[model samples]
Target: SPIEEQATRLLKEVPLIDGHNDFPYMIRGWFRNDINGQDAHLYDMPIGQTDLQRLQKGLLGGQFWSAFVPCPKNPDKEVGSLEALRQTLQQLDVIHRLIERHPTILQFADSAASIWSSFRAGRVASLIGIEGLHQIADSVSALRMLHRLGVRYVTLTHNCHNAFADAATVSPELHGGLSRKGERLIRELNRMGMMIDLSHTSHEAQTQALRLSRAPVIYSHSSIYSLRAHARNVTDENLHLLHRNRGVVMICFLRELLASEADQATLAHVIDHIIYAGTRIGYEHVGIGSDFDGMLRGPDGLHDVSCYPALVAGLLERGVSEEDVKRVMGLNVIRVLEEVERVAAELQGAGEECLCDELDEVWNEDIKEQLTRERERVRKL
Candidate 1:
């Protein structure tokens, strides 16, 4: 009772910002991204783990709703890559629509201030993140445009190798880590104020990104490698590196990554992972990133979004300090976002050259002449 009391107080005092969630992708699969008249089902869904009622029940103040499209499936690389770009937009569009349609319960947030503002007004801060670089279709301009469209982070890979980085799940180890283009893109990502996510990336790529990025990076939904030894988990070596880089590892709640047997996994294992990282790297580098709705089921006590208070109470019972608990809850991630924006402002103020993408002329000479004439007429007017 005492622990729960304190946990409830802490959650109210600070925003419990989750690092990643895939409710957007769930919408894509279940409703085909069409929410025209699904208000009844949207609040209490029959399918996925996340729903609007449970979200408010959890007392969650902020979330990074993933705009994750699947890896390219087409035989032709060019068309497949382009297809992913379009799908990414669809996912983003649906997320915007979800927040817009539920104005009283959700608020779109892109910065630390916005998060605080939404929390103060008792609404969930809905932030966006693209799950993979493949979602960008090999264009730096498109990645920047996604940032302009309110994507704050981009995972380098998502179970498939792309032009930039290697995925943890893929074999043959493409690029051995970050490729030449990947290294260059890291700088641009930093300059543009994007939070570089490393959850689906290989260990080598994680190290390369940690070293190369000017701004702090994040493992959006990964746990400890030392605990469960999964490719999706973060290793001790990388944990040390994350500390030096001033980054945060927002731990994931996937059962497979938590225990040797998926069925055997429980809420305790998730806490163990968090405690291990918090103890070694310090609590400031740790936060929650429940991959809710990304998996079929979650661990016992953390089976859904509404169980966050149990996590907070569990941490307090495990002897974590209130100050550190506040950091782990949301303040740490907020600090990272604030720092990311700061780095972007500093780099932009220093006149760092913006990254550019090569373009092909699509218009014929006649069409170009028409466009030129129209522009000249508008200018004259």
Candidate 2:
């Protein structure tokens, strides 16, 4: 009870910011992104892990709401890429509307200052992060525009490989890690003050990005690979690099990433992950990135956003100091954000040349061959 009391007091004192959530995509799927008459249901949803009432009950200080669209599936690669860009805008539009519609409950935040200000105002600091580079349609200009539109972070890949980086779950290991474009984009992302997220990226890509970026990076919603051996989880080697890069690994709550038996994953497992990184890399390098709304359900006791307080209590009960627990909750992420902004200003002040889009074919020879064959067959038929 005392630990619970401490957790409550700590949550109030410091904002507990989650790194990634996909409630926007949930709206896209459930309401066709038509949230016009959805206010009542928004607060009390029939599906998904997030809703306004439960979010309030969780006392979340801030959230990095994911504006994620699935990887391109159109056989016509060009159309698929362009479609992703369009869907990206739709996702962003809905997220903005969601925050704007509930001004009393959610406040849009794009920086550390904004997050704290919104928290002080007693509203959730709703920040935006796109889940993959594919969402930008291979355009640095579009990426810049996204940053201007208040997108603070960009996960390099989702589940599919993009031109810039390879994904953990995707096969054939495109580019072996980050392509040349990805390396260049890392500089651009840093110059523009965008936090590079490595959660869904390949291990090699994560290592390259960590070493390449001038600003601190983050694994938006990844767990411990040593603990679970999943591709989506971060390895011990990468964890060491994260410490050097001054980034944070926001532990994910996805059940599959937490245990071999997804059903057995629980809040205790999540705590074990946080403690593993904190103890090995220092607490300052660890934080919570629940990946809520992105999964069908969460682990035991952490079934929804409302369960964050229990996590905080669990950490304190495990003998984590109040300050360290606060670091894991949100302070570490805020620090990283502040540093990213500071680095951006320094680079921009130096008049560093900004990166521009390059002209290149979207598909490789193999894909082009397949497209040609399909077209020939259709013509013959």
Candidate 3:
């Protein structure tokens, strides 16, 4: 019993780094009062899942705010791309403005040390990640522009294919993993010292990205597809590849990814994915993503940022070591952030540019054609 108590206490002491969350969107929604303060809006509750007050209760160290945009269906060549980009940027700006208004509680973190320092100082560190390349409108310049705006990573594709790559849940009409533009985007990200996220890309895209990227990539929020048979989850082969690349996989808490059931999700389901990933990829490669405030329904006990200890307790119940638990809890992500910073420093030393100069012109092409093809492909799959 004392061991159990200690484990629970340790969970709060350890700073949990959630790799992907749509809390920015939650905050935006809250601004309109469309959702209440107590309910977990995205999942089941009429309210929201996370807020600054709950983050403190959760002992969360840092959260990567996912900048996701909705792609529209149309025959036009430039459909919804500009609006999507604008909306994403607006949400990101809203997050920054919130952090600024609440400077005592939140701060923007650029490196692992900053994240740790912020946690020790009792503040939440905010990191940014654009969830889809489509937000860039097929512009490498737009991708780089976001990076300079403090976006540390970019997930090449979201739930659908884009100019650069196909989604994991979608089939690609293009023969292989990445398009020529996608390859160029990867190279550009590497040169800019940005971590390429493969979380939503197809297995083929993931494989090609791993082989192509000079820096370690991340699956910011994904689970074991082999275990759950969800189209969005990663396979065992890909898990091993993440290990070989020294990358991290932040396990998602969405119930559908964890179990076959559509309604119920438990701590056990979440722990199963964590255990499976740790066993296959080593403890250091496993981390939490939670998908908090994004998922329509999350694991039952892990409804929001405040319920992280329950997940930690389940991990301890399953016989995960304290050292490994700490690693999985947040240390793994910290290590990855440190590596990113180190590489960024190296690139900066060589006089590498961080911002892309040609963003505007690239988004003007047959962007609607790209999204239409991707949508049709995913629907067929």
Best by TM-score: 1
- For model 3 the local lDDT of residue 20 reads 95
lDDT of 2 by residue, 1-381 (tens): 878889899989999999999999999999988999889999999999999999999989999999999999999999999999999999999999999999999999999999999999999999999999999998999999999999999999999999999999989897999999889999988999999999999999999998888999998999999999999999999999999999999999999999999999999999999999999999999999999998897999999999999999999889999999999999999999999999999999999999976677889999999999999999998
Those runs of model 1 whose alpha carbons end farther than 4 Å from true positions after fitting are 361-381
What lDDT would each prediction earn against the true structure? Answer: 0.94, 0.95, 0.78
Model 3 lDDT tens row, 11-103: 557777789998777656656423334334423334667776677676677788877766645567486776777777887787677666667
Sorted by lDDT, highest first, which candidate order results?
Answer: 2, 1, 3
TM-scores of the models, in the order given: 0.95, 0.94, 0.85
All candidates: CA RMSD in angstroms?
Answer: 3.2, 9.1, 10.5
State the lDDT of candidate 1 residue by residue for 191-233, as single tens digits: 9999999999999999989988899889999999988999899
In terms of TM-score, how similar is model 1 to the real structure? 0.95
The lDDT leader among the candidates is 2
Best first by TM-score, ranked: 1, 2, 3
How far residue 215's Cα lies from its native spot in candidate 3, in Å, is: 1.2
Q: What's the count of clashing pairs in each model shown?
A: 0, 0, 7
